[PDB]
């Protein structure tokens, strides 16, 4: 076999903005605002839409990360059977209690431009800081490495980590003796793969593309909205004080109505595009919350949901405006081909395997489990009897050993 760790990056939230429409449209002049109040209530709708977007973006991160009732901690001694999670557990030397992988994910996403959002544009801070999201991810990690999937249902119930991995091996359809006889090797494979993630995002410069795209879209929308304030829309000037102090009021008002219409249309296009992007980010955050519930708090049977392969378990990491899931999966490896039969003819009775298949290399037949080559002698405990041998297409001659008759015939005589 082979154990593989893959990464999935999902954006959860974007920036929260608020616009003063009177300050944006009207450059602190009393009478251009008096023409602006003749237009009714096009400004309260934009204000309501922006507040709804901001509250939704606060709700998204609380839906994704805040899913633990209590904050769990790792024990101060850290030996989990040879598995070594120092790359994903937070370290206390740094002033921010973040894992090394979270430290790189914070450093890679690059978040005079801030001195230009001064035309009624304000950026609101999120309710949860990066430290609190880091404590959510550390609580999730400690709860899933010290208890398993037990803390997602009721109370946290401790179990040793190889026993948890044997539970998960039974989950994917492999007997748990495959784990305990290969444990060290299995641990080494995990200790390889979690290493390679450390450079797999590091050499590649376009790995964190989605979060950077979120930052770039918000920045270019804000910059375009500020640059649109310096256009004329059909006037001699775009400057409101010059057109106010140059002409008489009866032509000044009917000319600055054009600037009012142009700036109002630019505001409306910005608000509608933020609404569409907020819908897309809400869908992505719903998917991230579903993957945190199903891949991290349990073991999933849905194909290709929690990475490629047969899902073993998963780990969360926090990122600027998003989450990164490290999916640990089991992948089969070096395979051999054998001859197979659907049943066995013994005494005019057909024998079907209880679990596993019949395999032969050419001389003898064995019962093996389906996901790992482990051949065993065909007995009456491995197989069950149903009908005679004239109905199954492909049934073969073989013998089935009864482990009761031999000891009776030996001990009684």
């Amino acid at each position: 076999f082979t154990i593989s760790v893959t990464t999935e990056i999902l954006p959860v939230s974007m920036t929260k903005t608020s616009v003063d429409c009177t300050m944006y449209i009207c450059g602190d002049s009393t009478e251009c605002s008096n023409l602006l109040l003749q237009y009714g209530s096009f400004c309260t709708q934009l204000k309501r839409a922006l507040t709804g977007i901001a509250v939704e973006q606060d709700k998204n991160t609380q839906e994704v990360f805040a899913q633990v009732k209590q904050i769990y901690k790792t024990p101060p001694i850290k030996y989990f059977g040879g598995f070594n999670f120092s790359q994903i557990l937070p370290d206390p030397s740094k002033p921010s209690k973040r894992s090394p992988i979270e430290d790189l994910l914070f450093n890679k996403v690059t978040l005079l431009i801030c001195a230009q959002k001064f035309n009624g544009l304000t950026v609101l801070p999120p309710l949860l800081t990066d430290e609190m999201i880091a404590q959510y991810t550390s609580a999730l990690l400690a709860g899933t490495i010290t208890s398993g999937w037990t803390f997602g249902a009721g109370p946290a119930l401790q179990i040793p980590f190889p026993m948890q991995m044997a539970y998960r091996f039974n989950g994917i359809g492999v007997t748990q003796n495959v784990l305990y006889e290969n444990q060290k090797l299995i641990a080494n494979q995990f200790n390889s793969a979690i290493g390679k993630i450390q450079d797999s995002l590091f050499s590649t410069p376009s790995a964190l593309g989605k979060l950077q795209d979120v930052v770039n879209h918000n920045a270019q929308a804000l910059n375009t909205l500020v640059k649109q304030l310096s256009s004329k829309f059909g006037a001699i000037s775009s400057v409101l004080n010059d057109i106010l102090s140059r002409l008489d009021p009866p032509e000044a008002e009917v000319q600055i109505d054009r600037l009012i219409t142009g700036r109002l249309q630019s505001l409306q296009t910005y608000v509608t595009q933020q609404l569409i992007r907020a819908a897309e980010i809400r869908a992505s955050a719903n998917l991230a919350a579903t993957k945190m519930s199903e891949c991290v708090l349990g073991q999933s049977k849905r194909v290709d949901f929690c990475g490629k392969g047969y899902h073993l378990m998963s780990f969360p990491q926090s990122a600027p405006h998003g989450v990164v899931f490290l999916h640990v999966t089991y992948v089969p490896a070096q395979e051999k081909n054998f001859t197979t039969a659907p049943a066995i003819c013994h005494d005019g009775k057909a024998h079907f395997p209880r679990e596993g298949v019949f395999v032969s290399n050419g001389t003898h037949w064995f019962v093996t489990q389906r996901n790992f080559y482990e051949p065993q002698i065909i007995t009456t405990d491995n197989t069950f009897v149903s009908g005679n041998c004239d109905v199954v297409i492909g049934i073969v001659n073989n013998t089935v050993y009864d482990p009761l008759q031999l000891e009776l015939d030996s001990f009684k005589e």
Binding site: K69, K73, T122, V123, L124, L127, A139, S147, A156, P160
Partner: protein, 133 residues
């Protein structure tokens, strides 16, 4: 952004007006009638000196700096007292800071959020916990 003075040859930057939003934090009006005021994204070492004789845009300036003035990352909070505690969030202010209306006799307080109760699972390599009920 910058202008050279045309009388003496030095360079001076231009910073625009502070401005911002004003939010009012209240409990229900069936409960009490006192409120707190948040000035958003503003260091309030200049809010106090901007309170002049009928110069600021909000006409009400009765609160001014009559104690309970706290600096947050989301702006300046006037009318709520910061405590060294951590409760579940009731009214969200921002940057990890929330506000509530509790005893101390009965007033509006501001605090940092408690993320949850603290726990530590007794992990060992040879111990398990099994439910009986």
């Amino acid at each position: 952004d910058a202008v050279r003075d045309p009388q003496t040859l030095e360079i001076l930057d231009i910073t625009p007006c502070s401005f911002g939003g004003v939010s009012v934090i209240t409990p229900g009006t069936n409960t009490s009638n006192q409120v707190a005021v948040l000035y958003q994204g503003v260091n309030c070492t200049e809010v106090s000196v901007a309170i002049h004789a009928d110069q600021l845009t909000p006409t009400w300036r009765v609160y001014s700096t009559g104690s309970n003035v706290f600096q947050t990352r989301a702006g300046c909070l006037i009318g709520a007292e910061y405590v060294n505690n951590s409760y579940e969030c009731d009214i969200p202010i921002g940057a990890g800071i929330c506000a509530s209306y509790q005893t101390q006799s009965q007033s509006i307080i501001a605090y940092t959020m408690s993320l949850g109760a603290e726990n530590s699972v007794a992990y060992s390599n040879n111990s398990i916990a099994i439910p009986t009920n």
